[PDB]
């Protein structure tokens, strides 16, 4: 059914889909406000402070319908220089299609209210650190930088926002999306791609604030999550299988040349540890600034650093290491890139009609416009000639979360609606570059932001920059919602920096958080390292005998699990079942899984609880009934919330006894045995 009743009388109404009550609307209690405001917005080099002037707030009262040909339209209105209009149809999969109007484009806000009950729990809205179930917030959605510390209360946060505001909040992310799951068993995907906010916070109706003179959402429905999740990447993408060599081994992350790289892989190597790669962010140079070492932004090798670099990936690739590199869609303006790009007109521009330079802390990156569909192609070449070509196996992708909001785009577009838009637009770029010569399944490239779209275009997921500390909101903890985020908006492929990343104020990474980070990253898609901002200040993988045996441990761990990991991957690839899961997606009527935020499922098989705090020897964590058993010590659990030792190499880690891989978990205290 698609379930709609109009009562002309009073201009009042209810939209039921498959029997989920989606709108109700009455005099007294409309569902639609229109107006207008001017955002007001100060970037703050990415840590975006967007505030509305609101000038108009107003509920149209009145409602008409008529029959189009695809079903019906509502005319709502309050007075005569106020109106908009709804229409309420099913699209070609039988998709319920909600399709808003206003009557002009200087009512350029959008409220919408959507029946809810108390009781139900919200997931998705992209990649969110601070919550997975969204009931009882709200939830701006633009992209930006995460934040450092994101938690007003915590220190490092108020210091973070004396310096740039750089600090956050709990929503901020650089892969919001206006995607979300209802616990009604339904999704919502809404196409625009203006500054929205999703209210989940009254018991009775979430409220869907738009920056926007018009409005287009669609919702399905389904029986179960798995089957939920299956129409949602129906609708909006499913990610490649991953290349076999993923599976291989930890990825270093390694800076300072050839020679570096190869003395750390071979230390590496000789100890026993399993690797399948190098990553070297800094294969195009090393800017110095006051601020510190940076990489230099333009994509091409450089030898003066990377000596051989060409010849020594073929010997590496010989003996079964990749070699991966690193992007993103600025280009320094001191350098050759930029220039030719100024000259052919592949640079954004700014309201005086010069190529638009972004500050970057003693350097300006200019913009590739990649709306311009020939300076598009060109950085898309860029990358063919310059990575491919050269024989890297992957990259990181990074960046997409900062278009400003004055620049001024060949496709003419606002700047306000491109912003949120440009990741998977520049996802789209290295998709490409891979499907144009033959690369897909082989290379793999990995994205911190992200936008509606991710989920076909980019081949893995990276958490970005947490803290090299033990915070809910911005350390090891923070990367569980945001898997769980993900994987319920459609993105099954995801990883983090082994350690974390952001070592600033003070913090510096431990041995302990680096060694604990390990033994979570060994039960997920993909294992890399990375040095950190500041290298010298941070524990590397490297630091003394036990840290490299733990990497052997923990390699060996995640090596012997490939065939299973393989699986859950192409499942992934073939229907949008996540790899790190929610457990209501196998737990259905286990109302505490709900509520669950820092475990998940690695595939249907095991539980995963990683330990987030310092200086824990034990861990306390919930099971849902079923035959459990520890994968350190084989002891039996049943269902109930329970706390297990957990030094250092052995993780709350939980496997299904009826499992047909059974005998590949128990072979984990088999072979770390002998
Ligand atoms: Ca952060």
Redesign the pocket.
Known sequence: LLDFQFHQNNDSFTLHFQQRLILTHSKDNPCLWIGSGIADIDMFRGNFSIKDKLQEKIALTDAIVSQSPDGWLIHFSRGSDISATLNISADDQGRLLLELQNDNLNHNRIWLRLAAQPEDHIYGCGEQ?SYFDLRGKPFPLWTSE?????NKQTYVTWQADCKENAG?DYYWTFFPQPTFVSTQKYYCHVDNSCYMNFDFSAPEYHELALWEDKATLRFECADTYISLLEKLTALLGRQPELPDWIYDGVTLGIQGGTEVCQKKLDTMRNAGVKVNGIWAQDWSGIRMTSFGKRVMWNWKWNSENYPQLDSRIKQWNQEGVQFLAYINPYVASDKDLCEEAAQHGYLAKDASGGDYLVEFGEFYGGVVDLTNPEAYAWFKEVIKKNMIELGCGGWMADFGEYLPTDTYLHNGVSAEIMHNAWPALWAKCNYEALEETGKLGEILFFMRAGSTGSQKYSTMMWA????VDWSLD?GLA?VVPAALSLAMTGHGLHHSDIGG??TLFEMKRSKELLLRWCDFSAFTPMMRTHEGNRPGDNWQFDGDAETIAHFARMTTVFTTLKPYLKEAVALNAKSGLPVMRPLFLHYEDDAHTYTLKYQYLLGRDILVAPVHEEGRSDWTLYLPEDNWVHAWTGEAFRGGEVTVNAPIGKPPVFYRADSEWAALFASLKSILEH
């Open positions: 650190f995460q934040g450092v510390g994101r956050g970005g920059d947490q803290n911005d923070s990343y952001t």
